[PDB]
Each structure stands twice: as C-alpha cells, then as structure tokens.
Write an enzyme that holds these catalytic residues in place. Structure first.
Site, mmCIF file in Angstrom:
data_model
loop_
_atom_site.group_PDB
_atom_site.id
_atom_site.type_symbol
_atom_site.label_atom_id
_atom_site.label_comp_id
_atom_site.label_asym_id
_atom_site.label_seq_id
_atom_site.Cartn_x
_atom_site.Cartn_y
_atom_site.Cartn_z
ATOM 1 N N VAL A 8 0.838 -1.193 0.000
ATOM 2 C CA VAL A 8 0.000 0.000 0.000
ATOM 3 C C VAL A 8 0.877 1.248 0.000
ATOM 4 C CG1 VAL A 8 -1.470 1.368 1.515
ATOM 5 C CG2 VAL A 8 -2.142 -0.948 0.877
ATOM 6 N N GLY A 9 2.041 1.175 0.636
ATOM 7 C CA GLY A 9 2.876 2.362 0.713
ATOM 8 C C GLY A 9 4.281 2.046 1.174
ATOM 9 N N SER A 18 7.543 -0.045 5.409
ATOM 10 C CA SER A 18 6.557 -0.408 4.400
ATOM 11 C C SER A 18 5.238 -0.751 5.074
ATOM 12 C CB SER A 18 7.013 -1.597 3.542
ATOM 13 O OG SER A 18 8.321 -1.420 3.036
ATOM 14 N N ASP A 64 -1.337 9.145 13.727
ATOM 15 C CA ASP A 64 0.056 9.616 13.687
ATOM 16 C C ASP A 64 0.637 9.993 15.055
ATOM 17 O OD1 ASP A 64 -0.197 9.131 10.978
ATOM 18 O OD2 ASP A 64 0.524 11.109 10.348
#
Ligand SMILES: NC(=O)NOCc1ccccc1
Ligand SMILES: [Cl-]
Ligand SMILES: [Cl-]
Ligand SMILES: [Cl-]
Ligand SMILES: [Cl-]
Length: 346
Positions: free
Chosen positions: A26-27, A33, A162
C-alpha cells in the site's frame, strides 16, 4: 506462538502469522513499508507496518519504543488503536524486526474536504475534540494535527492518526507546504515552551477550512504565514509579548505595524454564528487564553452531539522514559518486553 510464513513484497521479506492473508503493498517511506491484509481471526481488513531499521541508532531505538508505548496506550473510539504487534524472533537475542497492526483506513479528511453541510462540520469537529480531550487527559500532545492525519469512513466517523513518528525535518517545513499551515505560531517560530493548547489552534485551522473549502493560512514560508495569522487575529499586546522568551523573536514581532483583530463574521460570511463564536475562542494568539478541548465540547455549537457521560478520559500515561538516557540495546530490550506483553483488545 503462532506459525509464521514468509513472502517477498516489493523487495521486502515479510514474515507474519498465518492469520494474516492476502497481503498487498500500500505504501513505502523512510519509516518502513505498509501492506493491507485480511485478518482471519477477527474478520477485519487491517494495515500491517514493518518498521525499517528500528534499532539502528539510539535515536531510532528510542523512537521505536515511543511509538509502541503510545500505540499500546490509546483506547478510544476517535483515536487510532493497536490491534496487534508481533516479531518472528523467538528470543531477545535474535530480535530485529517489529510489525504493527491496525484497522485499514480508507479516506482521510483531504479525500472528502465533497460539499460539507454545517451538520457535517459539527459532527467532524466534535469527534476531533472528543479524541483530544482523551489524549490531553494523559498529558499527550499531538503537535501535528492536519487533514491528512484524520481518517474518516462512509458514516462520517473519524479517528486521529500519527503518534510517535519521526520528527519532521527542517526541509519538510519549508515553503508552500501543508506540513506547516496548521501549526500554532508559538511552535512554528519557537516563541516559548509550548503545551497542549497548540492542538486547539490546529483544530481551528481545520474547522475554518471545512466551512470555507479553503486553507485558512496558506503561507508561502514561515514569515508569510505569520503575516496572514496576525492580519486575522491582530498583533500581540504587551501581555503576550512578555511571554515570548526569545529576545530575537520579540524584537522581530515589534518591528511589525500594529493591526487589530478582524471581524470573524465578515471573514466567514454566511456561517453559523455559533461556529463563528467557537472559531474566535480557538484562534487566540495567547495560548494561555485559548478554549480547551473539555471546554469546547460544552459549547452550544455541539448541542446535538454533546453527552458528558460519554466523553471519556484516559488512564495515566507514564512518559518518564522521555528524559532517560539509555544505550541502544537497553531501548531494544524495553521494546521487546512491550511486544511480548501485548494483550489484544476484546
Ligand atoms: N504510529 C502511528 O500513529 N501509526 O503507525 C502504526 C501503523 C501505521 C500503518 C499501519 C499499521 C500500523
Ligand atoms: Cl496465526
Ligand atoms: Cl526478528
Ligand atoms: Cl494535510
Ligand atoms: Cl503508563
């Protein structure tokens, strides 16, 4: 111990428990990762992050410990939660890799901010403030609230993301960048010791943008952004100038011609008068005088959603480790203990 299996996903070797199936990238970033997966034990679609170089330096090892400590603490409907943490290592001596698992989040607030009714703004900002009351009750400061850090689903339900991530570089904060547009002026310019009130400034910037469809303070650099801020809220009086401990910052601010606070009803034309009132109480230059999250939940703008019996506070969060000096392998051993002691949620 579960059985693990191995597979290579875009140049990375992933070793994960059998319960996690259908992995797909996904990213990627300097942080590591991420893959999406299906969790056969819970039926959730999940996101799995493999940390890159978690213990390569003292700073890196302490950051890994911080992220795991913060994620393990957060147990609130409007905050990211930790579904699982694991390592394929069977002992501290072979411990190298850390994997973190959370719910798979689709859209952030950018991906919607659509045509938002005032009822939509009420419900979205209510949920941010409910999550902030919880975070602040544990003496946790977010410092980086912005639309890309707010996950939203199809039912308009919101979570704050976050925590414990790498600090933003000087170059990431330079120029015409959303990474700075939501920051309180006292931390953008290192005016003083800051505190949790910095997050309420960010909420004001987010709420204004939901109401107008436009960034509130889209500065082309630190100084341009400060000029946009002082045009709206006024230049500081002598009360606040005292509290700026940098003589240099004080000197610069006094070099600017004085300006009065603008009329917010003429800036946010057509908005709910109760929304205008709340924005005036969030976007106060003197952080001592801003509304707090617990106070803002009781503001009349949220009368449709406010329930003082369902706005919970957090268990105490011991962050004495933040002032502690340790060696790489001591931070790593502390992290290992927190991995093996994890208890999954109900
Ligand atoms: N630290 C934080 O706020 N979130 O990082 C945890 C995480 C991110 C993506 C996928 C799985 C876990
Ligand atoms: Cl398993
Ligand atoms: Cl390992
Ligand atoms: Cl953003
Ligand atoms: Cl604790």
């Amino acid at each position: 111990r579960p059985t693990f299996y191995r597979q290579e996903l875009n140049k990375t070797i992933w070793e994960v428990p059998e319960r996690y199936q259908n992995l797909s990238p996904v990213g990627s970033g300097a942080y590591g990762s991420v893959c999406a997966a299906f969790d056969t034990k819970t039926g959730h679609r999940v996101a799995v992050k493999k940390l890159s170089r978690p213990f390569q330096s003292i700073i890196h090892a302490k950051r890994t410990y911080r992220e795991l400590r913060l994620l393990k603490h957060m147990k609130h409907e409007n905050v990211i939660g930790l579904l699982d943490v694991f390592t394929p290592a069977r002992s501290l001596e072979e411990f190298n890799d850390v994997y973190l698992v959370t719910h798979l989040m689709g859209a952030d607030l950018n991906n919607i901010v659509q045509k938002l009714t005032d009822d939509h703004v009420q419900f979205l900002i209510y949920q941010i403030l409910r999550g902030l009351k919880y975070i602040h009750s544990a003496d946790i400061i977010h410092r980086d609230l912005k639309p890309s850090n707010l996950a939203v689903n199809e039912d308009c339900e919101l979570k704050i993301l976050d925590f414990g991530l790498a600090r933003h570089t000087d170059d990431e904060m330079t120029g015409y960048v959303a990474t700075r547009w939501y920051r309180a002026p006292e931390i953008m310019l290192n005016w003083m010791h800051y505190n949790q009130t910095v997050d309420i400034w960010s909420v004001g910037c987010i709420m204004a943008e939901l109401l107008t469809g436009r960034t509130l303070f889209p500065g082309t650099d630190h100084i341009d952004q400060l000029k946009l801020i002082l045009r709206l809220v006024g230049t500081p009086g002598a009360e606040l100038l005292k509290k700026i401990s940098s003589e240099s910052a004080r000197n610069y601010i006094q070099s600017l011609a004085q300006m009065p606070k603008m009329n917010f009803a003429n800036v946010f034309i057509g908005a709910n008068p109760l929304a205008v009132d709340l924005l005036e109480k969030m976007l106060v230059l003197d952080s001592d005088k801003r509304i707090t999250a617990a106070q803002a939940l009781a503001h009349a703008y949220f009368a449709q959603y406010h329930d003082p019996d369902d706005e919970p506070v957090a268990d105490p969060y011991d962050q004495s480790f933040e002032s502690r000096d340790l060696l790489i392998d001591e931070w790593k051993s502390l992290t290992y203990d927190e991995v093996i002691s994890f208890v999954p949620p109900p």
